Amino acid sequence: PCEKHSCIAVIDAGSTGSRLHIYSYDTDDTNTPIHIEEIWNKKIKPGFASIQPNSVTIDAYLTMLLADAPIHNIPVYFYATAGMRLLPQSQQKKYYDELDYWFRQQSQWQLVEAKTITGNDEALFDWLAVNYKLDTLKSVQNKSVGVMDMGGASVQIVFPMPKNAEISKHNQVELNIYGQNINLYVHSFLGLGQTEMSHQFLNSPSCFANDYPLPDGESGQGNAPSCKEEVTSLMNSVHKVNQQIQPLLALNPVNEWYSIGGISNLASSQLFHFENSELTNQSLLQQGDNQICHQQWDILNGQYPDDEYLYQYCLLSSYYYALMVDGYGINPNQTIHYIPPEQNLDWTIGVVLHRA
Amino acid sequence: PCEKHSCIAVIDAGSTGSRLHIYSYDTDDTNTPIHIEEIWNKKIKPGFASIQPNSVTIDAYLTMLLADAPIHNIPVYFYATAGMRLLPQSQQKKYYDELDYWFRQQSQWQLVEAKTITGNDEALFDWLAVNYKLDTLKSVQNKSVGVMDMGGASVQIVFPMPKNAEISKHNQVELNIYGQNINLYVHSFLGLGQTEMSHQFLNSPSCFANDYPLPDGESGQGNAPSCKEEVTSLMNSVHKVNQQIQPLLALNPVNEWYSIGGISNLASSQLFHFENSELTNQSLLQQGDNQICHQQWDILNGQYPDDEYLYQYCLLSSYYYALMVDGYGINPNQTIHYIPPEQNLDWTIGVVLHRA
Ligand SMILES: Nc1ncnc2c1ncn2[C@@H]1O[C@H](COP(=O)(O)NP(=O)(O)O)[C@@H](O)[C@H]1O
Ligand SMILES: Nc1ncnc2c1ncn2[C@@H]1O[C@H](COP(=O)(O)NP(=O)(O)O)[C@@H](O)[C@H]1O
Ligand SMILES: [Cl-]
Ligand SMILES: [Cl-]
Ligand SMILES: [Cl-]
Ligand SMILES: [Cl-]
Ligand SMILES: [Mg+2]
């Protein structure tokens, strides 16, 4: 396919492992990629930021990730995300010095850039990947599309907003796609992703099903409004999510919301009932509260012994609600679309659109 | 030494690696260990909770940790701490099933117990290890000794307090050491340890030296009282540290405080000036504020290019203060002793005292 079309590789170096995507694409007369197709996809574990940063360890890791690919001589972007953002810069630099050397030693891959992207650039790529899949990029807008990424270490939110000199430059992006200028607000809250935030609530009985054993030896005694309130303290008293986001959304309303990341896995599970790949915050909290928070744990576990996230769904349903409703200000009745997990939508498509 | 005295092994399976300690000891006429001496000490990396939990990976890890030890046939305790507490129980159980099998396959080591200890038991062992080293356990008290452990994922606080039926049983321990009954309040805040809490503040410019590059691309603009206020929101609005701890300390004052864990490394560094292995919260914050928070980063880095924690000392000095003063209620002028890092005091001594 790379003889008939252009090709580009994007490595998503995320917190649990690194995923190489190779895409073929064509370019239309606005200089924008079209017909983007993933032609190779390889994941390896563990996360890059968890491995020893010396040449032997990096060489083994990059060789396992890359050496099997069926194409010589294509541009590659190596983009690490929140996993790496959590490491000191001095530690990060040891990985990049070794990685820069490794790429210089070979010619199959033409490294364009290797860096830890900001959460705001990740949010940009999220918005582009979603809108590409929905086919909303090509014609002149008319409805505002917002995207939320519920990631493992950081969460992103991104939505159209005219340029504003009162708002930091880091929270705004300007781009032109399919011939149209776009202005977006982007924000990422590092620490607020579902794995990192969970580490603050593991001994909260409000956040777990009844009788679930907490690490400190106490028992869950779930209640989603209570758990939601505890999560909302982290969101608003610490991260100031409400103060930062709600006034901007009031002034630049979003007509349609799409979410990606873990909410898609919860909402697609056997325990929750959602159709048309959408949910409302009201339904999500009511179903978490009734089905997990106030449910006897051993009984529930006996019934769904294979979903290893089951025991976490009182906390996650409470947290998604606390983030969207108490943090972002979204009405509990507002439809939120989620991208099905079995659709393999990936933010790296955004990198192809913006950088290829 | 194990022919002339009793011996016991304690494995501290912590978040960055596992450390085996083998101790020799004698027992006095109160049935309490005395003359406790570490005779072998082996550390391996990475943390147990980060390795693949299958037999090959666990066998390699345990063999590297244990197989070199110069003693056959002694009791061993395998105690994991907050690293493992952060994993779901179902994940933990995969490690323990493999570990139980591994010990059953050999006879050099007589596994007594392998488990993830609660933060409250860790606090008990902290208090015993410190007071053992200070030689305060042997005679009838008279001054109240409190211990704080500033650990990487959880923090512990522990101090004498008469039994109280209004307080949860999990937060109280009764023991008899050197013939005397002891009642202690123990508390552990999981998520509040310095590595986990830092992941909530990495994009806070108040928490870093001026011009230090934050992951989101903004620049540090340090101010310790500001950074302290942000940390205090996590401590009090989320973890309710003040509400839980201050009323109990008001009613059961501590005459002498000892801290262990990372505060010892900061306070022993080239940048801070502390003598007699003690500090006050007032001095700690004033020195962080002047020397790191409001200091130009590149200049400071040029001067101390070898302390890889240097860039974190505005945040850590602010956080220790927020925890002790705003959380626990300690007067900013009160002396806090810290156990020098070069003294190799280890909480596993507490396990010998309590369980050998
Ligand atoms: N059932 C679930 N509920 C909520 N979040 C869920 C979930 N299953 C996965 N996740 C979240 O999605 C992330 C990505 O899940 P996957 O990509 O499905 N698993 P892997 O690539 O790590 O093998 C997980 O790290 C977790 O944050
Ligand atoms: N200079 C420092 N300032 C504040 N905390 C410091 C520090 N140096 C280490 N630490 C803290 O102590 C912990 C234990 O440090 P060490 O035992 O000295 N290093 P290692 O055993 O991981 O090789 C670290 O994980 C970190 O939390
Ligand atoms: Cl605990
Ligand atoms: Cl329901
Ligand atoms: Cl960021
Ligand atoms: Cl000073
Ligand atoms: Mg972690």
XYZ file of N, CA and C and ligand atoms in Angstrom, chain A residues 16 19 43 45 152 194-195 261-263 265-266 307 309 313 316 320, ligand 1:
78
model
N 0.619 1.948 29.727
C 0.701 0.482 29.943
C 1.456 -0.237 28.842
N 2.139 1.492 21.301
C 1.418 0.937 20.163
C 1.874 1.654 18.900
N 1.312 -3.738 19.348
C 1.482 -3.241 20.719
C 2.477 -4.064 21.505
N 4.360 -4.396 25.656
C 4.273 -3.956 27.051
C 5.666 -4.119 27.621
N -6.036 7.221 31.298
C -5.670 6.502 32.552
C -4.992 7.512 33.508
N -8.304 8.206 35.167
C -8.985 7.313 36.099
C -8.035 6.452 36.920
N -6.895 6.028 36.376
C -5.985 5.238 37.236
C -5.367 6.133 38.345
N -11.933 6.796 25.516
C -11.189 6.288 26.709
C -12.067 5.377 27.546
N -11.863 5.355 28.860
C -12.413 4.215 29.606
C -13.934 4.152 29.773
N -14.568 5.306 29.651
C -16.012 5.441 29.763
C -16.603 4.510 28.725
N -15.468 1.638 27.708
C -15.429 0.249 28.218
C -16.465 -0.018 29.297
N -16.562 0.863 30.294
C -17.635 0.758 31.271
C -19.050 0.694 30.573
N -15.309 -9.853 34.664
C -15.063 -8.436 34.331
C -14.184 -7.948 35.463
N -12.991 -5.246 36.019
C -13.192 -3.846 36.414
C -14.472 -3.664 37.206
N -16.686 -0.206 39.436
C -17.705 0.579 38.677
C -18.547 1.535 39.509
N -16.034 4.442 39.320
C -15.822 5.036 37.948
C -17.105 5.741 37.517
N -16.984 9.684 36.651
C -17.325 10.243 35.316
C -18.356 11.310 35.504
N -14.250 -1.971 31.776
C -13.626 -0.751 31.926
N -14.158 0.300 32.603
C -13.529 1.547 32.733
N -12.311 1.713 32.212
C -11.719 0.666 31.520
C -12.360 -0.584 31.361
N -11.544 -1.438 30.656
C -10.424 -0.707 30.358
N -10.529 0.537 30.914
C -9.583 1.679 30.822
O -9.194 1.839 29.443
C -7.757 1.720 29.337
C -7.315 1.055 28.032
O -7.937 -0.232 27.978
P -7.599 -1.327 26.847
O -6.902 -0.554 25.731
O -8.882 -2.070 26.540
N -6.564 -2.524 27.604
P -4.830 -2.594 27.347
O -4.578 -1.892 26.028
O -4.229 -1.851 28.516
O -4.561 -4.088 27.310
C -7.343 0.983 30.624
O -5.979 1.276 30.942
C -8.316 1.523 31.667
O -7.937 2.881 32.007
